[PDB]
Amino acid sequence: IDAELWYACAGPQKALPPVGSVVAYLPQGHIEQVASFNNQELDAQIPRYNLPAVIPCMLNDIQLSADPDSDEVYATLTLCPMSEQPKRKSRSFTKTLTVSDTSTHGGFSVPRRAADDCLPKLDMSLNPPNQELVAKDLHGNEWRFRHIFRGQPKRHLLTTGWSVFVSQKRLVAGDAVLFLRGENGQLRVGVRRAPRKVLTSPTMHIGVLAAAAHAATEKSRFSLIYNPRSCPSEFVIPYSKYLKAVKSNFNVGQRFKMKFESEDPSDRRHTGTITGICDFDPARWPGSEWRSLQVNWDESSSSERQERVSPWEVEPGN
Amino acid sequence: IDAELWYACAGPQKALPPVGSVVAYLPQGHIEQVASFNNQIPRYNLPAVIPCMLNDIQLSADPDSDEVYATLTLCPMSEQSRSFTKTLTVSDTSTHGGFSVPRRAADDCLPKLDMSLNPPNQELVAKDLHGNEWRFRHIFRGQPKRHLLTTGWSVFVSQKRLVAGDAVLFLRGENGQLRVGVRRAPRQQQLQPKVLTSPTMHIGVLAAAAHAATEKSRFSLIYNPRSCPSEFVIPYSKYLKAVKSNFNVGQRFKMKFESPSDRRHTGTITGICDFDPARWPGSEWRSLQVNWDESSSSERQERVSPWEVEPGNS
DNA sequence: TTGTCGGCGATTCGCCGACAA
DNA sequence: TTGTCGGCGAATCGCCGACAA
Secondary structure, eight states: OOHHHHHHHHOTTOOOOOTTSEEEEOHHHHHHHHHHHTTOSOOOSOOOOOOOSOEEEEEEEEEEEEOTTTOOEEEEEEEEEOOOOOOOOOOEEEEEOOHHHHOTTOOEEEOHHHHHHTSOOOOSOOSSOEEEEEEEOTTSOEEEEEEEEETTTTEEEEOTTHHHHHHHTTOOTTOEEEEEEOTTOOEEEEEEOOOOOOSOHHHHHHHHHHHHHHHHHTTOOEEEEEOGGGOSSOSEEEHHHHHHHHHSOOOTTOEEEEOOOOSSSSOOOEEEEEEEEOOSSTTTSTTOOTTOEEEEESSOOSSSOOOEEOGGGOEEOO | OOHHHHHHHHOTTOOOOOTTSEEEEOHHHHHHHHHHHSOOOOOOOOOSOEEEEEEEEEEEEOTTTOOEEEEEEEEEOOOOOOEEEEEOOHHHHSSSSOEEEOHHHHHHTSOOOOSSSSSOEEEEEEEOTTSOEEEEEEEEETTTTEEEEOTTHHHHHHHTTOOTTOEEEEEOOTTOOOEEEEEOOOOSSSOOOOSSOHHHHHHHHHHHHHHHHHTTOOEEEEEOGGGOSSOSEEEHHHHHHHHHSOOOTTOEEEEOOOOOOOOOEEEEEEEEOOSSTTTSTTOOTTOEEEEESOOSSOOOOOEEOGGGOEEOOO
């Protein structure tokens, strides 16, 4: 599976740690992930696993995948607890889908800025200028597309293969579609759906903790699943970062920034102020750095509301 | 909450224990369920049968895929009508045609229709498992006389995401209220892991059972009957009647596989052995080796449990 | 720049007998 | 009995400007 397509499909400004490197595994966040998939009806009556709130581990492997039907991405990781002790970027673009794009009656309207950035630079006055587009999704499938240039005024459009793309992939409005350009000119297509069993909530909610506890008293390797669309904050982060944050002193009234949204012309700076500092869930996880920062956003607009944050998630601001 | 549809949708010849009754919780078989979705040093000394109270059953279904499942609540004990199915033909699933109904199904369960009127037809509104209404036009035409579903068949086929090889189901019952169901054919690509890795389920299962048994506190679990080989929560009566029983080798037996005719295959007992002695010593789980006389579709379910089999006469 | 809508095709869909399996 | 197919109507699908935001 392609690195670049899997990352863009997952999340913007979302990256994983390097394999072979030491990383902080944070049980509290894995738990949050598991409570995301199926709304956790109760977390009560779980045996007391005196487990550190951060577990430093060797990262032994990353295995990225994708469901063949719904194209939902996830990765399989192999952590090993430890005894006490840039790159490249390819032209891409993303767009969230309007009901016109989804409507069967219509095709799809491409952004002006996006044709320029990544799509194949096209011919003069073909009356109406067009070129065949070959795309691969995350399974190597080819979806062919007619990218014609028309309307009055002129816009960039997709017609042939757009409609079949939307039924086969079961897309709707609010959703988003993706493209990458490689050196080869081979453009790739991806799908990031808008937000909407085998085991119970308590059985997962304890199998997580049981596994880690065993793999930590044993210093034996164990596995876990990263499902980035279903994950609020990353829970496997470079062991370096963690230590830099713990050591760093935030004090109240300090202002901060956060780098969630990137990859658009306007970075859209996110910002807020530090109201307080507390062990977030003192009951099971005392003394942790997990979501230990109380923050108040600068006039938030019914989006991205999460009042509590962790010290490696924020940059001291202005 | 409408049992009759869920069991027919679940599996032929499948019924659950009564709520409030004592049942054998058999972790080895629960392990197998979770191991069924995805092909797999945990150390949990757990009895191979844990006798339990059944405290509640909640039947459910994914509204998207119509996959059925049940959530059960066990508590350990210290103390010592008118139905029919068809697997969907490519004519049914194709957009060109509607659905060609078996003639015997029309007579058996469907509302008898007036043949006085030259194109005998009738509006049929059916309920699936989520309360949704599906309308259907059930016409009687062709040459020779056939029962067909025409208008609305296409929308049912796309919305419920049906293909050939799948099956459809319909029920009458006493209330005359018609219910519709879908038992999709098994695919192997659809079962894939997405919330937790297999060792973490494989030990969350044992962790849960292990704690709730030393404590005698309630615990919950999930039955996914379509993806389940043999049940792992069965009447404590059945377990104890088989355990006490002496099966000996060379004995003949019968067993209730799937299929309307409820046909059962037969065979002889090859041997009797602790199936997995290392992880589960002395257990009766699949402890019988049997060799089918009808090694037909070579299902090779050669190791089975003593309460799954009836000594085979008549 | 880029959504939505009416308008009019070429193309499906979808109801109908035939026909044997 | 019931699966498929040729066939012909008829209701979409899908492409094209207009028009404003």
